[PDB]
Write an enzyme that holds these catalytic residues in place. Structure first.
Site, PDB file in Angstrom:
ATOM      1  N   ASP B  13       0.708  -1.416   0.122  1.00  0.00           N
ATOM      2  CA  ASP B  13      -0.051  -0.059   0.024  1.00  0.00           C
ATOM      3  C   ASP B  13       0.813   1.269   0.108  1.00  0.00           C
ATOM      4  OD1 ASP B  13      -2.691  -0.974  -0.028  1.00  0.00           O
ATOM      5  OD2 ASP B  13      -2.361  -1.828   1.896  1.00  0.00           O
ATOM      6  N   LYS B  16       3.466   1.191  -4.974  1.00  0.00           N
ATOM      7  CA  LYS B  16       4.481   0.731  -5.977  1.00  0.00           C
ATOM      8  C   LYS B  16       3.577   0.518  -7.169  1.00  0.00           C
ATOM      9  CE  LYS B  16       5.075  -3.083  -3.420  1.00  0.00           C
ATOM     10  NZ  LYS B  16       4.143  -2.602  -2.370  1.00  0.00           N
ATOM     11  N   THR B  17       2.369   0.166  -7.047  1.00  0.00           N
ATOM     12  CA  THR B  17       1.591  -0.335  -8.412  1.00  0.00           C
ATOM     13  C   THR B  17       1.129   0.961  -8.932  1.00  0.00           C
ATOM     14  OG1 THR B  17       0.940  -2.365  -7.608  1.00  0.00           O
ATOM     15  CG2 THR B  17      -0.432  -1.460  -9.252  1.00  0.00           C
ATOM     16  N   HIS B  76       3.708  -8.923  -0.244  1.00  0.00           N
ATOM     17  CA  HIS B  76       5.022  -9.150   0.154  1.00  0.00           C
ATOM     18  C   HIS B  76       5.551 -10.470  -0.123  1.00  0.00           C
ATOM     19  CE1 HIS B  76       8.400  -9.053   2.884  1.00  0.00           C
ATOM     20  NE2 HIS B  76       8.013  -9.987   3.680  1.00  0.00           N
TER      21      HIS B  76
HETATM   22  N1  LIG Z   1      -2.862   9.958  -1.358  1.00  0.00           N
HETATM   23  C1  LIG Z   1      -2.267   9.146  -2.249  1.00  0.00           C
HETATM   24  N2  LIG Z   1      -2.562   7.848  -2.386  1.00  0.00           N
HETATM   25  C2  LIG Z   1      -1.787   7.145  -3.098  1.00  0.00           C
HETATM   26  C3  LIG Z   1      -0.644   7.447  -3.794  1.00  0.00           C
HETATM   27  N3  LIG Z   1       0.038   6.571  -4.514  1.00  0.00           N
HETATM   28  C4  LIG Z   1      -1.055   5.482  -3.962  1.00  0.00           C
HETATM   29  N4  LIG Z   1      -1.832   5.903  -3.367  1.00  0.00           N
HETATM   30  C5  LIG Z   1      -2.959   4.816  -2.853  1.00  0.00           C
HETATM   31  O1  LIG Z   1      -2.489   4.007  -1.907  1.00  0.00           O
HETATM   32  C6  LIG Z   1      -3.227   2.725  -2.272  1.00  0.00           C
HETATM   33  C7  LIG Z   1      -2.363   1.532  -2.195  1.00  0.00           C
HETATM   34  O2  LIG Z   1      -1.394   1.906  -3.607  1.00  0.00           O
HETATM   35  P1  LIG Z   1      -0.912   0.727  -4.463  1.00  0.00           P
HETATM   36  O3  LIG Z   1      -0.302   1.384  -5.530  1.00  0.00           O
HETATM   37  O4  LIG Z   1      -1.944  -0.248  -4.737  1.00  0.00           O
HETATM   38  O5  LIG Z   1       0.094   0.234  -3.411  1.00  0.00           O
HETATM   39  P2  LIG Z   1       1.039  -1.090  -3.416  1.00  0.00           P
HETATM   40  O6  LIG Z   1       0.403  -2.216  -2.493  1.00  0.00           O
HETATM   41  O7  LIG Z   1       2.352  -0.562  -2.733  1.00  0.00           O
HETATM   42  O8  LIG Z   1       1.137  -1.508  -4.636  1.00  0.00           O
HETATM   43  C8  LIG Z   1      -4.434   2.844  -3.219  1.00  0.00           C
HETATM   44  O9  LIG Z   1      -5.357   3.254  -2.560  1.00  0.00           O
HETATM   45  C9  LIG Z   1      -3.593   4.295  -4.110  1.00  0.00           C
HETATM   46  O10 LIG Z   1      -4.515   5.075  -4.661  1.00  0.00           O
HETATM   47  C10 LIG Z   1      -0.122   8.789  -3.691  1.00  0.00           C
HETATM   48  O11 LIG Z   1       0.626   9.474  -4.167  1.00  0.00           O
HETATM   49  N5  LIG Z   1      -1.158   9.671  -2.828  1.00  0.00           N
HETATM   50 MG   LIG Z   2       1.004  -3.141  -5.806  1.00  0.00          MG
END
Ligand SMILES: Nc1nc2c(ncn2[C@@H]2O[C@H](COP(=O)(O)OP(=O)(O)O)[C@@H](O)[C@H]2O)c(=O)[nH]1
Ligand SMILES: [Mg+2]
Ligand SMILES: Nc1nc2c(ncn2[C@@H]2O[C@H](COP(=O)(O)OP(=O)(O)O)[C@@H](O)[C@H]2O)c(=O)[nH]1
Ligand SMILES: Nc1nc2c(ncn2[C@@H]2O[C@H](COP(=O)(O)OP(=O)(O)O)[C@@H](O)[C@H]2O)c(=O)[nH]1
Ligand SMILES: Nc1nc2c(ncn2[C@@H]2O[C@H](COP(=O)(O)OP(=O)(O)O)[C@@H](O)[C@H]2O)c(=O)[nH]1
Ligand SMILES: [Mg+2]
Ligand SMILES: [Mg+2]
Ligand SMILES: [Mg+2]
Lengths: 397, 397, 397, 397
Positions: B13, B16-17, B76
């Site tokens: 979260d 990354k994606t 993870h």
């Molecule tokens: N406010 C905010 N939310 C973000 C940002 N980047 C990602 N998110 C939010 O964080 C959550 C997880 O992001 P995601 O890319 O799926 O995370 P991952 O698990 O690292 O892949 C989603 O609800 C995204 O919209 C950002 O720059 N700002």
């Molecule tokens: Mg992801």
């Protein structure tokens, strides 16, 4: 600006001094009353470091990004001794190779030595492009150089190679060959040679200088962190003298103040848990558990001092057993000459095989001196930590 | 142009994606562009590698300077298994850290895993800057990340750290936080992450696949050169199975033709002087003399396969003695669980200490599998080669 | 004949509808209007605007000089709702005050509302003169009215005040009190209430409806110019969402044609220099630089919708957080009930204080709606723009 | 007769002085507005408004409906300095425009200054109609002027434009162009230009002159109420020096008597609850809560005094920190020459950006001075209150 120590290496007469002079003149052109000229650098001071005399020129100049400490040496002997005796720290080298001559014997020796001392980045200046009657001569030498670099452990394909005339640059002539090539060189140096670091990211390593105890608190080992970061509570491992002790640093002391951490370069007292004074001694090395292991056998480039430098008057043969001083320890060892070599002549430098009585922290690149009696007979650089042969461990003592 | 394998790492979260999607979208602006959207990437397809399934998304994009193969994983566990299994090459990692959360448990594990698998450079993207009001927070997190980088072996002060909002970038808004950060990120990736190499400048290393003899010519060892360059007449050393045989390669053959040299990636037959066919065996490693040393004790990050992954049915305890397979060799070893773990949790990775019955080539970063009978119960990566303690000897089988 | 929108305001039962009916009666004679009996106007049709219901009678009549759209509403609640929402635009008002009753509460509230929505011209009709025993009363009411007019921003001294009997006029009796007073009233309306203007001299203001890009030309924002003149080459500033972007309008497009200028009321596409789509969004207001300042806090008269109008069923308390929609933007806001007020009841209008998450173009006189999810729960009118307090700035969203 | 402050504005040599003189005659003939001849006026009685030199010609004349304080200045520089310093208050302006020259640079510059100082009403006199042959030239000039008025915020469509010959009126010839035009001018002036008002309806604003204590009663701030009405019990807010303090006026003292209210123009003592003398200071502004907001950044038309006037005998760069005085406060400020301007020559006026180390009451239209040491180097008029850039905030004094 960040400070970087560099130096010109390469075979004699290829233009190292002319390049160095040209660099100081070009960079000191943005206004300057005094800067070292060729002649003034060609005839450099004589620095007696630990009895060994080495003629070395040390000039300083700065680019639009970094301040440089640059060393240039008159002869090959100065380089060999200097690089083995670890007198002038080095973050990167400017390998000068005269186009009309191509890589020469000293070119290869300097590359080997630079590699062995820890230089992982080199910038190549193909000098004397003015005296070349064939551009074919240039393209061919660069190829030969990149293969030479790869042969000696450097990334030949990634190494910046600048072609030009240090002379034209020094005499402010033909900008495309002189001035421009030197600017291109300095740019390559600013971008390809890494800025020195105190290596805070490497596993901490603390050569124990001494040991003492504080009634009611425990045993403390003093020393200077050679690398990494030591944190209060960190697990540690003492290595050397055929022993391995694992414990935890329960306290760090500097300037009579308890601290939560110490970093490379700090002279500190590390309070260790459980261990008693007789358990530790000068010579051991406290490091992050598992990060390093003692070595008993090593291959090293060793400079044998001459009688003038206070070393041996006569040669020595294999199995010669001087005492090695490295870091904070001292250990008896046996020298093994290379195949063929029957004698090790004073003033000579060679790749020797050294076997310590007991495994000690002797990392590749680590420097040491060899002492027999009360005099230093040699100074060296660990180049490899070969596997102890069955016959080696069956050695006598 | 240069191809580079990268991937996003970091705690779930943290973005990354979203960053990956932002990058593809942004670099898709014009030309022959067809990019993958967040959903597409987030719903990463599963892939099976040697009985182990992993959900991984793979996207491609090119900056003006390079082409990139980019891996992004949902959970993870996906990264843990993927990075320990060594499925694909990784030249660099993009560590995503959410600004409001700061470094988290998986942030640490991925950094460590990345460093252990050999990733020498990472670029950090401090994400969700939009969700912060106090730049004071961001400044602290950057400082915290630099210490974290240094803590895990990376040059914290040198590592590019970009602060931004992958979300703003993805949703094409607030460019200072969005688009511009992604552009700075990609620049940093282009410049800080090294292009892969065949490591031709490293000491040659040839894991022996097999051995045969040609009457009247001699003994031949077959195998693929893992790194460096081998030349006809090169001195070589075989290491493994408590043997140190030093000789010379008098002949190199490929395609039924003799060669004067071969390099990393070549599958070849190397004719060796003197030695007989019984003197050698599959599993030994032929390398440049003194370049590497066999190890008997190693620390490694090991993934314990699930019962459904073909793994073991009963978790093993410390002192279990599976057979380790690495390179072309296999050797019995004894496992020592981490201080704090009484059992090896199935489907879980841990830091094990393994001791081989005999010293074998086991370099840090080297992968291996552990087999109990004919089934693989664990796949690991060498993370350290600690000093073999006197006790480690006294252990029998 | 120029068109003017007018309407009767004043306290219930003072004679607004009778006057309105008298006007149509008197003008129907000469064909300047269709006579609408008191009964027809009194039983005003219910109209629905954005869910909000209000009963309002609309009549049209023409004086030799102008054509009029006259709005008359049954109850005070209709006037309040109508003016807060601006359902019926007013260029001027005819304030009716019964001489026998004098200025009443709604007389004050309507003048206040009229001022707050931008009405600068009011003509007064002191009605029921037939019911006042003498001039003393009348002369005193007139004086009171002029004073009241001045109290709410109008020029009580310049404001026309006609005395008469709308009833006599309507029933065509007592020419002096009736007919004559209505003719005088109309003459005053023709003269004191100015015809509407597009405010071309006011600083241009263009709420951005959308943003798009034209390859080779740049970013275009669309919107209707609310006031002023926009000329190609004009400097502009985008305000809202805490962004301060200044540039120049390099192109104006309407009807697929490039124009050198546009005026209030024009729906256009403005090409703005240098900005990319990512820089702009619906909600920003493009305006003459420095002409307006975003506000983050306002006081407003807000009508809270009933459930029958699609609003809440239950009252809300202070600190309620709907989303404010005004112009082309939407922004979260926090509501602060009036001192003492503990609940905002559906169907009630009250003075609220609203603080936006971010400053936006929100001017005095500007209208907005408050939405909670997918339903409008309130519609308001900005009446003041108080500076943010310290605790206001310390709001957590 | 009501008094209305007025003055002529317009490009040099368009007939401002001639029109002025022509005015003093036509009214001095009928009554006693004792005319002053062109040369007298043309060579205005040089006045000084705080060292600042200003050649301004003052003349009084009366119309059956009003008395006028008319001012005429020789050169452009006089008007610029006069309007910027507000040395001569203007309730209206008489814009002179040569019908043969049409609007010129100064015509535009004066209209802008007029708008910047609060002038909301202008009357235009198209002069030299005698030098123009074609009537189209004239009508075209009027249209251009109405466009110009609208461009600067004035209602170009309702602004009185009188065409004629000030020279003819002056020399009493051709009544149509001379006399009759000036008669139309004055009538428009009496009609179009409203009478000033202290403005008792805006939020009370009291710049604090000093603070004192009445033991047993409380802290008292003194000052003259610049606008509005202050009543005992009213809540108040002290703004400036980033100290937002709110409280209640528990007492009002004037002429040694406790009053319930005070209004604009009253020099009074305001007793405030709870606050201690240390809590307040001269320079703060006491105002109705939220009625005004402190500004730390501002754009302003600043006149840089000449050495002859006391200004810094040299120009200053975008990096200069004089001290700004306005209202009853003083504050160090950083002057930012607009992008492009590299200096600030004495005697020259220009748009400057000013950053104060602390948010003070600095409204648009508010005047201030800039001092170096105890010398006034410049006097200005606030024209805009730009937002502080994250850059501006990161300013160290
Ligand atoms: N406010 C905010 N939310 C973000 C940002 N980047 C990602 N998110 C939010 O964080 C959550 C997880 O992001 P995601 O890319 O799926 O995370 P991952 O698990 O690292 O892949 C989603 O609800 C995204 O919209 C950002 O720059 N700002
Ligand atoms: Mg992801
Ligand atoms: N033609 C030519 N001669 C050069 C150039 N650089 C150096 N030299 C000459 O080569 C000789 C050796 O150069 P020097 O810098 O002393 O070599 P070093 O021993 O590497 O320091 C001197 O005679 C120089 O003038 C060059 O670019 N072109
Ligand atoms: N005596 C008298 N009654 C009037 C006059 N104008 C209106 N009314 C009466 O006052 C009452 C209210 O008038 P109406 O026009 O409905 O008032 P509104 O509520 O202001 O629209 C009705 O009974 C009217 O007939 C007037 O001039 N004289
Ligand atoms: N032909 C003509 N000349 C005029 C008129 N008014 C002024 N002038 C001339 O224009 C010149 C400038 O007039 P002046 O009043 O000094 O202009 P100011 O600088 O605006 O005050 C003088 O030479 C006047 O004689 C006019 O109505 N007609
Ligand atoms: Mg030299
Ligand atoms: Mg009615
Ligand atoms: Mg003049």
């Amino acid at each position: 600006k960040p400070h970087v120590n560099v130096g010109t290496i390469g075979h004699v007469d290829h233009g190292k001094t002319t390049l160095t002079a040209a660099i100081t003149k070009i960079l000191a052109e943005g206004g300057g009353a005094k800067f070292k000229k060729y002649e003034e650098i060609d005839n450099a001071p004589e620095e007696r470091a630990r009895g060994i005399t080495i003629n070395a020129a040390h000039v300083e100049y700065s680019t639009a990004a970094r301040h440089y400490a640059h060393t240039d040496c008159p002869g090959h002997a100065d380089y060999v001794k200097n690089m083995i005796t670890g007198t002038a720290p080095l973050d990167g080298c400017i390998l000068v190779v005269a186009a009309n001559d191509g890589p020469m014997p000293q070119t290869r020796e300097h590359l080997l030595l630079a590699r062995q001392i820890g230089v992982e980045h080199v910038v190549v200046y193909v000098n004397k492009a003015d005296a070349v009657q064939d551009s074919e001569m240039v393209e061919l030498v660069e190829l030969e150089i990149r293969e030479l670099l790869t042969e000696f452990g450097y990334k030949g394909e990634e190494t910046p190679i600048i072609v030009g005339s240090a002379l034209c640059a020094l005499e402010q002539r033909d900008p495309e060959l002189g001035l421009k090539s030197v600017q291109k060189l300095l740019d390559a140096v600013d971008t390809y040679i890494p800025v020195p670091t105190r290596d805070l990211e490497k596993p901490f390593l603390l050569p124990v200088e001494s040991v003492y105890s504080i009634p009611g608190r425990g045993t403390v080992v003093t020393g200077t962190l050679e690398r990494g970061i030591l944190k209060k509570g960190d697990e540690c491992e003492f290595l050397g003298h055929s022993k391995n002790i694992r414990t935890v640093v329960t306290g760090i002391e500097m300037f009579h103040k308890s601290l939560d951490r110490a970093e490379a370069g700090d002279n500190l007292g590390a309070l260790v848990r459980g261990l008693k004074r007789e358990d530790l001694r000068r010579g051991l090395v406290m490091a992050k558990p598992g990060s390093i292991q003692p070595h008993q056998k090593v291959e090293a480039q060793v400079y044998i001092l001459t009688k003038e430098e206070g070393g041996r008057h006569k040669p020595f043969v294999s199995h010669f057993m001087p005492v090695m001083f490295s870091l904070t320890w001292d250990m008896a060892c046996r020298i093994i000459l290379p195949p063929g070599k029957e004698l090790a002549m004073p003033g000579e430098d060679l790749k020797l095989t050294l076997i310590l009585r007991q495994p000690m922290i002797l990392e590749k690149g680590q420097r040491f001196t060899l002492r027999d009696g009360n005099r230093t007979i040699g100074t060296g650089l660990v180049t490899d930590t070969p596997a102890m042969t069955e016959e080696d461990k069956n050695i006598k003592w």
